[PDB]
Scaffold this active site. Structure first.
Site, PDB file in Angstrom:
ATOM      1  CG  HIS A   1      -1.843   1.164   1.075  1.00 20.46           C
ATOM      2  ND1 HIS A   1      -3.239   0.966   0.984  1.00 20.46           N
ATOM      3  CD2 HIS A   1      -1.724   2.468   1.429  1.00 20.46           C
ATOM      4  CE1 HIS A   1      -4.100   2.119   0.926  1.00 20.46           C
ATOM      5  NE2 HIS A   1      -3.184   3.073   1.549  1.00 20.46           N
TER       6      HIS A   1
ATOM      7  CD  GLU B   1      -2.040   5.761  -2.651  1.00 19.38           C
ATOM      8  OE1 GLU B   1      -2.779   6.761  -3.222  1.00 19.38           O
ATOM      9  OE2 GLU B   1      -2.574   4.840  -2.383  1.00 19.38           O
TER      10      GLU B   1
ATOM     11  CE  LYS C   1      -2.248   5.686  -6.996  1.00 16.55           C
ATOM     12  NZ  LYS C   1      -3.357   5.393  -6.070  1.00 16.55           N
ATOM     13  CG  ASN C   2       1.662  10.569  -4.725  1.00 16.45           C
ATOM     14  OD1 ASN C   2       0.657  10.753  -5.215  1.00 16.45           O
ATOM     15  ND2 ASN C   2       1.696  10.366  -3.522  1.00 16.45           N
TER      16      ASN C   2
END
Ligand SMILES: Nc1ncnc2c1ncn2[C@@H]1O[C@H](COP(=O)(O)OP(=O)(O)O)[C@@H](O)[C@H]1O
Ligand SMILES: Nc1ncnc2c1ncn2[C@@H]1O[C@H](COP(=O)(O)OP(=O)(O)O)[C@@H](O)[C@H]1O
Ligand SMILES: O=C(O)CCCC[C@@H](S)CCS
Ligand SMILES: O=C(O)CCCC[C@@H](S)CCS
Ligand SMILES: [K+]
Ligand SMILES: [K+]
Ligand SMILES: [K+]
Ligand SMILES: [K+]
Ligand SMILES: [Mg+2]
Ligand SMILES: [Mg+2]
Lengths: 374, 97, 374, 97
Positions: free
Chosen positions: A231, A235, A238-239
């Site tokens: 997780h 995240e 992706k950023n």
């Protein structure tokens, strides 16, 4: 809510990865787990419920918040049935398990539902500094408890659910005693890459380096919950991908890679994701962790950092505006040092909800400062 | 006439200050005031200053609304009362011992 | 100390680099500077003195602390003579200047003297968590005020001291309107290198890269006080060199360079010093900024960060334990946004000195947790 | 006999707790106690717990010294009094209405 007051006054019992592992590998006595959980789960719920009651009334009033409260109440009450029911009955044992499944199910939408509530509240009453930091304080605590709640339930259901065909057979419940960090890095990358390619039609490549100071050639492995680490990585990747691809979408240069360094020392496992996505001014770094300041909901970064802090790690971001950003996940290298970090309801916590704005400690300039020229 | 009350006057909050802008009220009419609570942001030429409550009680009435520029030194900014029972009397604008 | 109470209740007036510059370049009216300083200096002293009075008695009692207080009192009183003395007298103007020289001189040892005091106090009464954070709070504020004090005095003496042969003739007082960052980086490096070579007989090389996003080929320049930036860089370079050389003193590998990236964006000037000196576990990162946790006094890192925060910048450290450390200085790119950040004495500040320990907000494990194995 | 006082008994601070170690006192004999102040760290098997003052007054006497292991539930831990004038009486170990 006399039962809630009482349970909210109890202190939570933080467990270590070591203990989860030692219990599942070497013990794995269902009785023991029941005696622990039948008590620990209502303690943790009650600690949170007490805090949701301290929220501003305008927020407490939102149907979403009221719905969460009543889910928690329903769960609390269902678990309290088990306070006087003997373990020496294989019958009780089985029903308790079903109860856990049920409360896990009931809680599935808690995160989006709560988010909804604060979104409803922000859009209807405006954004306010002293209240903002209050909500932040609340959400960190509330979401961490929810995470720990799901941790405890999963261990018991995975260990005693009596599953014939376990998805991850060499794991201990949801704990991988030999989690290969780079493999989880690659998997998290690939699944971000996929979502990024879908929308932008391009995605940077991953490069992964390791340095195992503990023992220089060995693949870095840790005792951990792989889904948590996944997780966090997903995240950040992706950023990094969004920023990289947005920056170079009108350039001729060609996309820089997203780089990952995984390191292992005496105490720390560290994971640094670096991109050249142009960075972020310092003034905005701290807002990135606000839920209510906020293609591909501004929750990814605060929730990720809650996963890191949950076993005594942390998640930090550092940028050079104009070039890029480093995001670093710190985990404990040693499972014996990876204790749950749980919000405790007490007077300290209550004070945080009851604090009115104070004068700034440090100076602030005029918004129209005197012209020193004349 | 009116129950015992007290006017909060705008002080020189810096040594050169002759006037200030009431940028923001940090207390509502009705609210309890403790010594040292934040009462208003006052903006000058030189700084934005957290103005603190100097005496305890209850906010009875606000005299100078949010956004008033160039309020002189000495202007009554608000009315404070000892007990909350007295507040309603002031929606109308010495035993204070 | 009725005069102190009163001055301590006044709010300080934070100035911007822009204002210092606009005043010195375009105005440079001595009258104006006198009217400002005769008031602002006693305000700033009194704000601090009030806080030193709130220190624990065991610390307040140390001869070093008492000596500092009386220096400050002496200065305060000497400046208060000027409250009723007309500027329209070139005579007053000249004596006031002499007074500034005198108080600057009197204050020369303030930093070591105060340090001495807290060292005396720590060694005599033991290290205590809630008091520690208190002292930290105090020292940050106290040392920042001292810095701002020296800033104001230097501008006035440099501008009106009537010096025939100014050391830095194109500067405005101590402000360089075109401070070439890389040059200050090289100078700070060289002077650390020298001290490091002296003791270790070796020192890593510097490598410097720049990226001016504002305008990609131009040398990075900022409006700043070069001596402040120098102090910060020197302290970080010294730490980086010590760590690098200590790590490789028994290796065959050859010393890695110390790298510096200077970047300029719309808001931030950022300076990142990276070394491969083996890093520091996360748990110890925050202590590096403690004065009283603490070859070549543990003050370099906290003081450096006070210089950065003083004009709205910051100083941050990030490590990967086993490999190395990044230290980043953030400054404001725009002088109009570089306001002094000054400690204000008010109830908020007082509360920090008057706070007794509270229960932890978040859980803590047992030091002997239950063995889950049996 | 003695002035009005109150004993602070060690509660079950967690649902399974049968005993606790008094790790550290966070208040001194003589000090004022407000509701919710930190009184002691209590260590169990399961946690280190910040034990809070539940009633206001003054710390009259400490019954269980710092470092006592395995203190049962219910043991008096300390004596609290209403006014500070009364403290000296307790260096000797119902109007409390
Ligand atoms: N690596 C990065 N580079 C540049 N900007 C970033 C980076 N990571 C985060 N940000 C900024 O921080 C914001 C918050 O991120 P997050 O909480 O994940 O929510 P979301 O991605 O849904 O906006 C992003 O909107 C983006 O502006
Ligand atoms: N770049 C670095 N690499 C490794 N360790 C560091 C680095 N910077 C600081 N440290 C650690 O932080 C400590 C505090 O530094 P500082 O406040 O400058 O005081 P001093 O250098 O006098 O110890 C150092 O003693 C060192 O242990
Ligand atoms: O009490 C305490 C020890 C806890 C042992 C069982 C834990 S690991 C719960 C199973 S999820
Ligand atoms: O007041 C205010 C404006 C200040 C103008 C003079 C400042 S720059 C002091 C000289 S050090
Ligand atoms: K509790
Ligand atoms: K966010
Ligand atoms: K003040
Ligand atoms: K230090
Ligand atoms: Mg995201
Ligand atoms: Mg140093």
């Amino acid at each position: 809510p006399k039962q809630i007051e009482r349970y909210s006054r109890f202190s939570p019992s933080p467990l270590s990865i070591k203990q989860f592992l030692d219990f599942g590998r070497d013990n794995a006595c269902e009785k023991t787990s029941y005696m622990f959980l039948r008590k620990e789960l209502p303690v943790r719920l009650a600690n949170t419920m007490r805090e949701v009651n301290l929220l501003p009334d305008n927020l407490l009033n939102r149907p979403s918040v009221g719905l969460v409260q009543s889910w928690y109440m329903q769960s609390f009450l269902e678990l309290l049935e088990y306070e006087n029911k003997s373990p020496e009955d294989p019958q009780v044992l089985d029903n308790f398990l079903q109860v856990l499944i049920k409360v896990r199910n009931r809680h599935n939408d808690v995160v989006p539902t709560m988010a909804q509530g604060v979104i409803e509240y922000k859009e209807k009453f405006g954004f306010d500094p002293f209240i903002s930091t209050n909500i932040q304080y609340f959400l960190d605590r509330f979401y961490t408890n929810r995470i720990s709640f799901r941790m405890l339930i999963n261990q018991h259901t995975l260990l005693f659910g009596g599953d014939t065909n376990p998805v991850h057979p060499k794991h201990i419940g949801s704990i991988d005693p030999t989690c290969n960090v780079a493999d989880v890095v690659k998997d998290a990358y690939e699944t971000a890459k996929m979502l990024c390619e879908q929308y932008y039609l391009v995605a940077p490549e991953l490069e992964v380096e390791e340095f195992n100071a503990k023992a220089p050639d060995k693949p870095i492995q840790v005792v951990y919950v792989p889904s948590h680490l996944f997780h966090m990585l997903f995240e950040l990747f992706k950023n990094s991908m969004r920023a990289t691809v947005e920056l170079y979408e009108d350039r001729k240069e060609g996309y820089p890679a997203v780089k990952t360094l995984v390191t292992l020392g005496k105490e720390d496992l560290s994971i640094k994701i670096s991109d050249l996505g142009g960075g972020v001014p310092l003034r905005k770094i701290d807002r990135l962790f606000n839920y209510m300041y906020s293609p591909l909901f501004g929750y990814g970064l605060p929730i990720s950092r809650l996963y890191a802090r949950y076993f005594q790690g942390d998640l930090k971001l550092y940028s050079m505006e104009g070039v890029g950003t480093d995001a670093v996940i710190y985990l404990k290298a040693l499972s014996s040092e990876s204790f749950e970090r749980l919000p405790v309801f007490n007077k300290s916590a209550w004070r945080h909800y009851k604090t009115t704005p104070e004068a700034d400690d440090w100076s602030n300039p005029s918004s129209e400062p005197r012209d020193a020229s004349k | 006439s009116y129950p015992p009350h007290m006017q909060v006057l705008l002080p020189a909050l810096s040594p050169t200050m002759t006037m200030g802008t009431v940028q923001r009220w940090e207390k509502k009419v009705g609210e309890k005031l403790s010594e040292g609570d934040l009462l208003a942001e006052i903006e000058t030429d030189k700084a934005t200053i957290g103005f603190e409550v100097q005496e305890e009680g209850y906010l009875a009435k606000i005299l100078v609304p949010e956004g008033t520029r160039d309020v002189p030194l000495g202007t009554p900014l608000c009315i404070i009362v000892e007990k909350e029972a007295d507040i309603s009397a002031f929606a109308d604008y010495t035993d204070l011992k």
